[PDB]
Structure 1
Amino acid sequence: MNIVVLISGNGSNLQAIIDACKTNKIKGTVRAVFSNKADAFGLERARQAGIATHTLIASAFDSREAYDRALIHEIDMYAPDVVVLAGFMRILSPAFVSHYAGRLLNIHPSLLPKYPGLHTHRQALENGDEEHGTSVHFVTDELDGGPVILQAKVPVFAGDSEDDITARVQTQEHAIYPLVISWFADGRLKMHENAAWLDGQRLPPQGYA
């Protein structure tokens, strides 16, 4: 089971995946880590875990398509069974998404469908939300960003600084992501007709409940 992870920053989620593979919780290996930021701490985490790293900087390419072509080419060299986005802050092209059909996973710091943008934790506070969270889903080129696989709930308290909305959700992310990937690794999770299927069971819009 070949796993290729895409990051842009710290890589705490990448670490959770690396740790899960190391303990065999996930019956596979992270073959390579791709970063679109030259100073991502995740590049160190990967290097320390003995994982090959590739850094593709936008400013280093002539066009958007040229970047995606290099990204697809280099990723495909690892024959990945699954491509997981773990904090990758680059908008993927429809062509890229299509190329990795039901092999592309992503974790969003929000209760999809909700705050499908940035500063999700910020909007959760403004709106005065009583509960926030994160969502793992399949990435597809449909009206909706693809079927949700698993969501983790987190309660918001009043004087919520910003953090432990931010760090409370991150704690949930480190648990649900490696679990969803282990499911995929075991062959229990599939993507059909823009819908997530766990053990032959179609999952609801909110993922597994």
Structure 2
Amino acid sequence: ARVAVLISGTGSNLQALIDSTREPNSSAQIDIVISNKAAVAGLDKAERAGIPTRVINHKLYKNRVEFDSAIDLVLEEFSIDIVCLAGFMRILSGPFVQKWNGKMLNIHPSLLPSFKGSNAHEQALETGVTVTGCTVHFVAEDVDAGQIILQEAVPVKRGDTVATLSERVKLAEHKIFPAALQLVASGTVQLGENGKICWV
């Protein structure tokens, strides 16, 4: 499978994906990295790996559908099979999500369905859980609500900040996100017709 990775920042997940797709017997190759923001570290990581990049600035579009169509155009250019959202911070419109249904994965830093949203760590700490984690899911229109592929539990330490917890969870992210990409790329895991996850 030919893979795009969309990012908005650092790109530590991008890196784990790159390294994993270059292990032998990988069912995936990363062919393009798209950022909605210029001068983010993820872009340099992609270029250092020999992978082409684009910056599609979301602020230069009147609405989400137009921004999403610009992404889609690039995805076709590189005939992409699967899209991974790796720190991508833009909510995608209905038609884009529908088009990529069963073919687009996201990494979220909580054990869904707890702590949906971009500030999951802040929520985990506020709530006072001793166990949080991360989730790879198919992307549905409803944010952080698509079908769960893999999850990994991560302890919260008394006195954790958002920074310390975030770093501990990213270590788990870097395990399950490549694993889940291989599962979907190999056809081992699919979004079944009934809208439910299916393992072959």
TM-score bracket, normalised by the shorter chain, equals over 0.9
Q: CA deviation at 1:120?
A: 0.7
- Following superposition, the deviation at residue 69 of structure 1 comes to 1.3
The alpha-carbon deviation at position 162 of structure 1 amounts to 3.0
Stretches of structure 1 that go unaligned for 5 or more consecutive residues are 200-209
- Across the aligned residues of Structure 1 and Structure 2, the Cα RMSD in angstroms comes to 1.6
| 2:55 paired residue number | 55
Q: Which stretches of structure 1, 4 residues or more, deviate above 6 A after TM superposition? A: none
Q: Which amino acid letter does the alignment assign opposite residue 198 of structure 2? A: W
Contact 1:131 1:156 in 2 (8 A): yes
Q: String of CA shifts for 1:52-98, please: whole Å, max 9, x gaps.
A: 10110022223332211111111122221211111100011111100
Comparing 19-28 and 174-183, the one that deviates more? 19-28
**For the structure 1 residues 18 and 101, does the alpha-carbon distance in structure 2 shift closer, same or farther, using more than 3 Å as the test?**
same
Task: Provide, for residues 106-165 of structure 1, a one-character-per-residue CA deviation record: whole Å limited to 9, x for no partner.
Answer: 111111111111211111111111101110001123697211011110111212233432
Paired position in structure 1 for 2:95 = 95
State the one-letter code of the partner of 1:134. C
Conserved in 1, the CA contact under 8 Å of 2:93 and 2:141?
no
**Structure 2 runs not aligned, ≥5 long:** none
Name the % identity: 41
Give the Cα–Cα distance (whole angstroms) in 1 for the partners of residues 73 and 67 of structure 2. Answer: 10
For 2:197, give the aligned amino acid. Answer: A
Q: Secondary structure at the match of 1:97?
A: helix
**Shift in alpha-carbon separation, 1:91–1:142, aligned structure 2, 3 A:** closer
Change (3 A) 1:187 1:112: same
- Does 1:10 pair with 2:5? no
Q: TM-score, normalised on structure 1? A: 0.90
CA distance in 1, matches of 2:55, 2:38: 6
Q: Secondary structure at the match of 1:30?
A: strand
Q: Which amino acid aligns with 2:195?
A: N
Q: Is the 8 A contact 2:108 2:144 kept in 1?
A: no
Shift of 1:185: 1.9
Distance 1:159 1:80, change over 3 A: same
Q: AA paired with 2:16?
A: A
C-alpha separation in 1, matches of 2:15 and 2:140: 25
Instruction: State the TM-score, normalized to the length of structure 2.
Output: 0.94
Q: How does 1:116-195 map to 2 (within 5 A)?
A: 116-141=116-141, 145-192=145-192, 193-195=194-196
Question: 1: distance between equivalents of 2:133 and 2:139?
Answer: 18
